[PDB]
């Protein structure tokens, strides 16, 4: 009757299942046919209810603390890993469901938790498995995995940044985004990309190097949410902001932006009630207005100067800085008029 008996049972249960799978793997010996060494199936060990209950508990701060004392993150991650590796990208509903519940618990356990983020990223096999799930037929599973990667890419340490890059999570998520149908999924995928696009220049270059990614991201700037939400424009515009430092020095990529009416839409964003949107737009305009006569002229002609002037005295530091910087670029480069 130990106080955390339920939690201990759940964690021991998924751990024992991983042992069972390891035992199967290691029993592949001559004469060990499928009848002597059957491949374990998670239904045989009540795994989906186990992770379901673990997911529910992980929403509570106190339960998370107990879960962390019992090594819950590692246990849940190893479970997710073994099922992904054993059964691959299956459409089996039981497998999809347990992978979703496990990833939800991992998202909860990584929220604001320095140690857990670093631990999960250090589990390379698990990280590779997470990234592979982005190609699942299940967009709901994609959504969950992107949620995990989102948390791992916030305040990532040096090892974690390197790992996230080495498992190819940036290109995987960008390619995933091009294929998503559901808003819920896109939201989570873009949130993760938003954080990852900030890690280093190489990550920005990887996003830009995905065929169709830039046009797609400019597309998100005018997304029409079926819910009453601005999340897609915020995160899409956020990625564009981060990546625009590289685009600024790339003529071909500027041209893709022009083809998709990027500057004009960014100006419309300056009128947004969302500070995040205005702020992202200011940053993007700052980069795009830099050292480019063509886009400078375009912005003048669109009346960007008076719009930016309206923002320089903003209480919001990013907005005030970005607007002033972009305005400076335009003011220093007045067309013949």
């Amino acid at each position: 009757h130990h106080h955390h008996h339920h939690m201990l049972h759940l964690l021991e249960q998924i751990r024992a299942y991983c042992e069972t799978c390891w035992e199967w793997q290691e029993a592949h010996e001559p004469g060990m046919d499928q009848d002597k060494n059957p491949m374990p199936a998670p239904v045989e060990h009540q795994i989906c209810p186990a992770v379901c209950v673990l997911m529910k508990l992980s929403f509570d701060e106190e339960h998370r603390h107990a879960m962390n004392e019992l090594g819950g993150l590692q246990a849940i991650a190893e479970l997710l890993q073994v099922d992904c590796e054993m059964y691959g990208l299956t459409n089996d509903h039981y497998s999809i469901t347990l992978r979703r519940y496990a990833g939800m618990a991992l998202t909860n356990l990584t929220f604001g938790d320095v140690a857990n983020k670093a631990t999960l990223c250090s589990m390379k096999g698990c990280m590779r498995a997470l990234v592979a799930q982005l190609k699942s037929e299940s967009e709901d599973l994609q959504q969950v995995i992107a949620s995990v990667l989102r948390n791992l890419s916030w305040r990532a340490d040096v090892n974690s940044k390197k790992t996230l890059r080495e498992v190819g999570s940036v290109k995987a998520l960008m390619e995933c985004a091009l294929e998503v149908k559901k808003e819920s999924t896109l939201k989570s995928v873009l949130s993760a990309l938003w954080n990852l696009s900030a890690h280093c220049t190489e990550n920005k270059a990887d996003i830009c190097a995905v065929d169709g990614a830039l046009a797609f991201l400019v597309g998100t700037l005018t997304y029409r949410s079926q819910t009453n939400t601005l999340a897609i424009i915020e995160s899409g515009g956020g990625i564009l902001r981060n990546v625009s430092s590289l685009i600024a020095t790339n003529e071909d990529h500027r041209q893709i932006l022009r083809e998709n009416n990027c500057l004009q839409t960014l100006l419309q964003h300056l009128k947004s009630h969302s500070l995040t949107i205005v702020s992202n737009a200011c940053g993007t305009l700052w980069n795009l207005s830099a050292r480019n006569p063509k886009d400078q002229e375009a912005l003048w002609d669109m009346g960007a100067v008076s719009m930016l002037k309206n923002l320089i005295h903003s209480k919001h530091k990013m907005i005030a800085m970005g607007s002033a910087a972009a305005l400076r670029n335009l003011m220093a480069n007045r067309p013949a008029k």
Binding site: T107, N108, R241, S245, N287, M318
Partner: peptide, 13 residues
């Protein structure tokens, strides 16, 4: 400019 971020969160659908 400084890069911006989405931050992190508890799971939401």
């Amino acid at each position: 400019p400084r890069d911006s971020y989405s931050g992190d969160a508890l799971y939401e659908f």
